[PDB]
Amino acid sequence: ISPIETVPVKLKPGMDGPKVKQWPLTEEKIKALVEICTEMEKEGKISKIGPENPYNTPVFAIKKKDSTKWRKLVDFRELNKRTQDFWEVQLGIPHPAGLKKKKSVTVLDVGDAYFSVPLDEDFRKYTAFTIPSINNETPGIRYQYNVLPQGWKGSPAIFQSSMTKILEPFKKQNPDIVIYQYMDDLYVGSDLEIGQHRTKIEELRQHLLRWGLTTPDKKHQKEPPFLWMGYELHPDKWTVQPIVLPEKDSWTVNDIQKLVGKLNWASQIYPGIKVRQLCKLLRGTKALTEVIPLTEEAELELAENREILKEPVHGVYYDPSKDLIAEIQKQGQGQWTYQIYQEPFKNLKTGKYARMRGAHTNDVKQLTEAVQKITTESIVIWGKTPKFKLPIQKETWETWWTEYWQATWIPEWEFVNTPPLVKLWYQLEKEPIVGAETFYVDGAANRETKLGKAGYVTNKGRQKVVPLTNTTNQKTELQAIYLALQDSGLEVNIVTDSQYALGIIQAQPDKSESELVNQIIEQLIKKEKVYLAWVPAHKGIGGNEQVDKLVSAGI
Amino acid sequence: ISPIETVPVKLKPGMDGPKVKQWPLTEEKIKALVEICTEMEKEGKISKIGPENPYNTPVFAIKKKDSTKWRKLVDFRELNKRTQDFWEVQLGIPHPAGLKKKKSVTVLDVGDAYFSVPLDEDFRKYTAFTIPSINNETPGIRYQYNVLPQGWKGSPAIFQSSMTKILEPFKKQNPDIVIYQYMDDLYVGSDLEIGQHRTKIEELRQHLLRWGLTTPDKKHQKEPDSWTVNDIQKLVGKLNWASQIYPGIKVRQLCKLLRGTKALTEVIPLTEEAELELAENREILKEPVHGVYYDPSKDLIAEIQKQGQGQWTYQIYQEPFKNLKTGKYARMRDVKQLTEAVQKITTESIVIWGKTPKFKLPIQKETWETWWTEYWQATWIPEWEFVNTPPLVKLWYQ
């Protein structure tokens, strides 16, 4: 019971009530599922016998772990399936990083709640179940619910909803003592002199109890630094709690998957944790029990992470509004990271940004990629975008968006002297240097035979070819550029028959992910003027027909 | 009291109401949205709270023009696929192939009409949606529409009879002025009436208000030597490549010119199969030369806008290298630039084809989801896709 207002529930169009029977655990079952089913009325009437005309559902008694009485179970999956797309789903996680601070909060849990709130009437008939009645020749004991049943998604949606109807008059009779709910759990908090908080908790617990929901407590029963989804929190600050136990090698992919788990959750506030190499190798591993060999560096990502994991990293000022909300990206963990903060020391939120995206999306381009995670993140956590303290500055940034082939927009960002990363490492001259030895590029290789060819041919009747075996044309065309650079100085104009090959260079990448490209970059960083230019894939172009030849024949 | 006075709106066989998302709106953005929705609820019918229906539809709050107040721009994109596209057969408002030919077009936001005037029955439940709460601290409750939603194409389909009669007294007093209703907007277009249109439009902006409350709040007057070798790497390269969106037309005897090697020297400049092919091609490049380029009201209109610098080139085409219109928007001093182009194009695809195109935007997926809703005024929502990594210009233009 509860004098509340029932929510209409229709069965997915076309379907009908569950026809699922079962077959007994003898006296163990029935006996347990009766000394209890009889209290489904006489001790809070939660169901009514009404055995013949309806459908059915799965009766089953369990209970074991840390208690003293045989619990019942009927998480009816058929009914469960004949209505379910039905409600709007419970779906959100308020990030502590933003929960503003109350002076004192409290978490009154709620009694058996998803059973207090009522359940329709032009429905209940499908929440029936048969308890065989007597021994073997058990006549047939049949009930059917009258309230939200345990394990039927109507329950959480309807419930979350019946309780915020009830919490409204209160939540109106006294604003400022605003609250939050996530399943039998009301995290009530306000900035009240503990004393009056003590009673205004009574009122909440009282207004509850006159709508059923008999909130079990003694005006706040619960260890004061609660366990959220992780997020051990307190009006003081918050944090995450137990974070490890990695014995020693025999490290299967099943484990590594969880370690990047354990590590990531932790990213929240522990500065500079950084999973690249520990999930790096985590590839293929199509099987849990595949004890993947760790690596050299993973040891460092666990290492450098290990020591980081002390306790000189905990909480935030929570949202404390009126303060700019600076967010600086102290980026450069051989990857990119950030911390959202408010005032001086203690941080607000710590989050990384490793970029598993690109043929080396530059510092500049990786940085931007990161501002729209913070920007996106901020917008959700506090409902606004942050002031940005960026290790970049005009020029570098300035010119790149100004001249990058795609679009982007960034909030107030301001620079700070630190490890620069301003990737203006190498730029390309737009007008073919004259009084320069233009090299003709071409590399090739066969599909079947792994026979590749590192070409090139200049206007000074020069030429060379370095053979390669075990490549693909889109590799030979890059060594086909490395050479040209490697066999010249200062200037140098390269002509190629590859849109791809240049796309790399032109994107002006960085970081070793493909050593040809890794060096085709270092050359550039130090070669006074360069100028890649494209020429139609072969088709007899001047200079290109020539080299074309060199690298072709040999296949 | 109305009272009963609906129209039987329904969904295509094998369908369910949208169950979209709702982008996490800036707080101020919700603050208003929460206002717009409360006046709406007390303004009756237009909205009423739901609680056991799953359908949801993205909702944004924005401003329009030089800005002062806000406005909800509700994203019925899947309810369209879900209803309109189906209920696009009968109710449908067909498209006048002269509206473009009538060179001057003013468009009126005659959409407020859709509200209280008519309504949904038995189907209100699909126009559901939610107004958030920063960080989901509260279950930011959801409303339901009880009148024609100023958003979905399903409305004007309903409102074409009321709208027709209303515009009737004018369609005569002022005979053939092509009037096209598309979706909450009217493209009343006309011949180059010497700057005039200013007149007739306000004449109609007024006729609407007299003979009805259909209100296009305000006149709304949208009243419209060195021929270096490398030079051929360029010339040829693209030339060779232009004609691809053409048949195999000559370039080669201009081509071959660069034989041997040596790239900073000038070639010619003066030759047969050179000048008489550079030009031969030169005259070949003029919009109308085309071919079997046709619209097939049956295959989607794809579009690809290419960021130019201060300028932005765009290209609406139905299927591969066969552009059906390929011009350039361009306003010096940029996300909020694409914003103005993606709108310019759709507002033009419409006047021309009765349907917006599917955008392939050169922007990071999410740097758009964060603020397309900044300088985005128009009420419809072109369906876009983020195509990146990358396009190929270095010409295409000149």
Ligand SMILES: Cc1ccnc2c1NC(=O)c1cccnc1N2C1CC1
């Ligand atoms: C887990 C959780 C989720 C949402 N809000 C809160 C909490 N619980 C708290 O203990 C809490 C801590 C600090 C500030 N607000 C808090 N509260 C708010 C209600 C006072």
